[PDB]
Structures are given as C-alpha cells and as structure tokens.
Amino acid sequence: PISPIETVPVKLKPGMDGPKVKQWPLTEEKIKALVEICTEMEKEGKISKIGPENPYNTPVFAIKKKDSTKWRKLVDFRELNKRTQDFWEVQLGIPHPAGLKKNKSVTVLDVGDAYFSVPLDEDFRKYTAFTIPSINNETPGIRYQYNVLPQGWKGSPAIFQSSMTKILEPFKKQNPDIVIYQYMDDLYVGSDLEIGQHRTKIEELRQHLLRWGLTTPDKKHQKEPPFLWMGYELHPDKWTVQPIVLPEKDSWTVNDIQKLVGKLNWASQIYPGIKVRQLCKLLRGTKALTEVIPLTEEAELELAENREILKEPVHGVYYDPSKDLIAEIQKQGQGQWTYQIYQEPFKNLKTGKYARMRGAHTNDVKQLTEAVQKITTESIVIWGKTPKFKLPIQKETWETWWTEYWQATWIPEWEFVNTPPLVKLWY
C-alpha cells in the first residue's frame, strides 16, 4: 500500500522474550481458509516463510466478517501485546476522548488493512511468527512472520498514528464536533448529529480514507442484510446501568423476606448507607418458611430507602487508569446474562444485562461470546481499554467454540471462574 518509510524501531520489555504460545487445533475448513489467505499475503510480500531458527509462535484463527462468506485471518497477539506494552502504552500511547461515551451515535470502522502499507522493523519481525497447523499432524505446518504491521498487535495503531493524523486532518478541521478515536484496528467516530446527518458524515469520512487506500465497508462487510440497518452504529448516551432490584410482591412469606434480608445484607459491602435493622421484621423466632407475614411501617421505609441508594452510583468508586478492568458474567437463564465491571471486588464501575432479545440461539457459548463482545466494546468506548473476563464456562468448551461466533478483531484477557450461588443478587 502507501509508500515505505524509516521503519519505526521497536523493542520488547527487557527481562522478557518473544512469545512461544502453542497453536490451538483448527478444523479443516478454517485451516484451508488460512492457507489461501496466507498464500495471497505471501505473494504480496506481507509475510514470509521462516525456518526452524525462529523459536517463536503466536496462534492464529479464522473468523467470518459479519456472516460474510469471506473468511478473515485473526491472530491472537495477546502475549506479544503484553511484552510490548511499554511501546504502545507509554512511548506511543494514543489518547482516549472522554466525550465519546456521551455521544448520541458512534460508528465503528475497520481500518486494519491500512497497516499493511507500513513495514515493520526487520529486527522485530521474528517475534511475530505464527503457524498454520495441519490435520492429524501429517505435515510440519507452514510457518510465517510479518514484514508489515500485523492487524492484532497494539504496536500497529501506535506507529500508524502519524499517518492517521494526516489523513483525518482535513475531515477534522471541517467537522470540529465529531469525535474520532482509534483502538487497535478500529476507528470510533461519534457525533451528536441526527442519525441521517451522522450516517452522512461517515460516508464523507470514508471518501477521505479511500484516497489513502482504505476502502472501509463497515459492519464487517454486509453482503446479506438480515436486520442490518446501516454500517454498525452504537448509541452510548443511552447505555444505562442495571440496578440491584428488590421485589415488590403483594404477599411476603418468611422465605421471601429472608431472601430480601440476604440480598440487602450483601448489598451493604457495596453501596454504603444500606440498612435492614428495621427490616429483620417478623423473621424473629422460628416460623415455617411458608407462613405469610404482614408488613411493618419502618420496613416499607427501609425497603423504599435502600432501593434509592441502590440503583445509584456506588458513592466512592472511581476508575483508576492504572489498574486493570475486570468483568464478571453470570448465567441468569432463559437467554439472560448479567455482568459487572470493576477494578476492586464489589466496587462496581458498571453493571448491565444482555438477552437473547427476540433472537440469538440456544447455544450458551453463542450468547456468551456475544455478551463478551458487547461488554468489551462498551468498555473500549468508556475507558479506552478492555476488561479481563471471568467466564462461567469450561476452559475446553470455550477454547473449542469461541471463534465459531466471534466477530471482533481484538481478543480480551479471560480466566475461567466458577460462579458462586450469589446470582440471586443480580449484580
């Protein structure tokens, strides 16, 4: 693509060596897709075969754009991004606008193909080695390394930052109230304009891109419009927090109140001010769980006042730019999933939900991967970083199926937890 240029020299965080991550086994159809793709990138000089002298490895997979019959190459650079953090975080960090999260609309445009214009420091290429495995280990398996900026590495946006500024410049100057943000591979464009005017300004922005060789048909190539509206648009200013809900029954059994007292008790270590003293109501003695019970006056107040506190920002919690973001997801059933985002346990910076929404499919893994992308995306808009997920699933089942439904070009950190019987307390 675009002309050469003195390759920006890169370097790993000393005391650390290149990645040596094993390649997860792939299905035949994904392997094939990959050799085609890699054979083409080779003919174009994007990558080159390498010998055994290279001891490095980063895994690769293959996803579908937006159901588009056109496979896309996905490289898991999580490890490399970690040993390169210095580079892309401090040395060439990219600023995150606080205004973006307040915009009426945000369109996500994929600008990854743009990275193949610039060459990568020759002394850093050995670290980008990946391997296309073969079925049943019948042959060694094709090995490669990049010659240009790879698409899943955080080093790529950092470096390309210089070009991107020149490209958007005219567009920025002519549209001072449109927020543009770049987060590895994607461009987030937001405006308070009316949908019609917004969609129109995105078209205008693509024309500018197009002149630098960045044909960017978004929503991940729309070749078949099912519920497809435009080009993949987010509406942040309408993202609302999910409160901790307290029942509102017409009858209160001992059991119902015991459960009420439990969720409240828990909601004390989070959301300061909560009280249930005047609420230990009739649950004094030894009654049958069945036995329905009346209602006190202090109670009505207790309950009413507590729910006021809850459903509100936990006073005292603030995002710390230095600490990692953690996301936890609970399986609620019937296509319902709840999640919280925090840096320090039970100090929620945000909570939410995600449902089948008159759609989705009977696959838990399916819904779960969709929830992770939704949550990661909101996280990128709001904070400028992805959270580390605590997934309620078996490591093996996840690793085997996630790529089957994944559509983003980034991959977040994830550890497999085992959900406590908390659930009842949604948050």
CB distance 214 to 113 below 8 Å: yes
Query: By C-alpha distance, which of 174, 226, 213 is closest to 358?
Result: 226
Closer to another protein by Cβ: residue 26 or 47: 26
Least distance in angstroms from the C-beta of 211 to another protein: 41
Q: What are the tokens at 147?
A: 């010659």
CA distance 327 to 379: 9
| Binder among 19, 59, 112, 133 for another protein (CB under 8 A) | 133
CA distance 1 to 95: 26
Closer to another protein by Cβ: residue 240 or 418: 418
User: Does 9 interact with another protein (rule: CB under 8 A)?
Assistant: no
Residue type for position 270: I
| End-to-end alpha carbon distance in the chain | 48
- Tell me whether residue 17 is annotated as binding: no
CB distance 155 to 11 below 8 Å: no
Least distance in angstroms from the C-beta of 393 to another protein: 4
User: Does 172 interact with another protein (rule: CB under 8 A)?
Assistant: no
- Report the phi/psi class of residue 317: left, alpha or beta, with left for phi > 0 and alpha for psi in -120 to 50: beta
Closer to another protein by Cβ: residue 165 or 394: 394
DSSP state of 206: H
CA distance 206 to 140: 42
User: Does 418 interact with another protein (rule: CB under 8 A)?
Assistant: yes
Q: In 245-363, which residue ranges form alpha helices assigned H by DSSP?
A: 254-266, 297-309
User: Does 51 interact with another protein (rule: CB under 8 A)?
Assistant: yes
CB distance 118 to 5 below 8 Å: yes
- Tell me whether residue 185 is annotated as binding: yes
User: Does 287 interact with another protein (rule: CB under 8 A)?
Assistant: yes
Q: How many residues bind another protein (CB under 8 A)?
A: 64
User: Does 52 interact with another protein (rule: CB under 8 A)?
Assistant: yes
User: Does 54 interact with another protein (rule: CB under 8 A)?
Assistant: yes
Four-CA torsion 397, 74, 239, 321, nearest 10 degrees: 100
- A 10 A CB-CB count for 109 gives 22
User: Does 311 interact with another protein (rule: CB under 8 A)?
Assistant: no
User: Does 55 interact with another protein (rule: CB under 8 A)?
Assistant: yes
Q: Which stretch binds another protein (CB under 8 A): 98-106, 133-141, 160-168, 186-194?
A: 133-141
- A 10 A CB-CB count for 18 gives 20
| Binder among 12, 246, 282, 360 for another protein (CB under 8 A) | 282
Q: Which stretch binds another protein (CB under 8 A): 150-158, 184-192, 197-205, 288-296?
A: 288-296
User: Does 39 interact with another protein (rule: CB under 8 A)?
Assistant: no
Query: By C-alpha distance, which of 336, 358, 340 is closest to 350?
Result: 340
| Binder among 15, 43, 69, 136 for another protein (CB under 8 A) | 136
In 141-215, beta strands by DSSP E: 142-146, 179-183, 186-191
Q: Cβ contacts of residue 270 below 8 Å, gap of 6+?
A: 314, 346, 347, 348, 427
User: Does 286 interact with another protein (rule: CB under 8 A)?
Assistant: yes
User: Does 138 interact with another protein (rule: CB under 8 A)?
Assistant: yes
Task: For the sheet with 130-132, list strands across it.
Answer: 47-49, 142-146, 130-132
- Tell me whether residue 186 is annotated as binding: yes
User: Does 372 interact with another protein (rule: CB under 8 A)?
Assistant: no
CA 67 to chain centre: 19
| Binder among 9, 176, 196, 420 for another protein (CB under 8 A) | 420
| Binder among 11, 13, 25, 321 for another protein (CB under 8 A) | 25
Query: By C-alpha distance, which of 166, 179, 75, 196 is closest to 127?
Result: 75
Closer to another protein by Cβ: residue 187 or 425: 425
User: Does 250 interact with another protein (rule: CB under 8 A)?
Assistant: no
Least distance in angstroms from the C-beta of 266 to another protein: 8
Site for another protein, residues 376 to 415, rule: CB under 8 A:
391-394, 396-397, 400-401
Q: What are the tokens at 85?
A: 């953090």
Least distance in angstroms from the C-beta of 7 to another protein: 21
* Feature table: binding site: 110, 185-186
Which residues of this protein are in contact with another protein, per CB under 8 A? 22-23, 25-29, 31, 51-55, 57, 133, 135-141, 143, 253-255, 258-259, 261-262, 265, 280, 282-290, 330-331, 333-334, 363-368, 391-394, 396-397, 400-401, 418-421, 423
* Feature table: binding site for Mg(2+): 110, 185-186
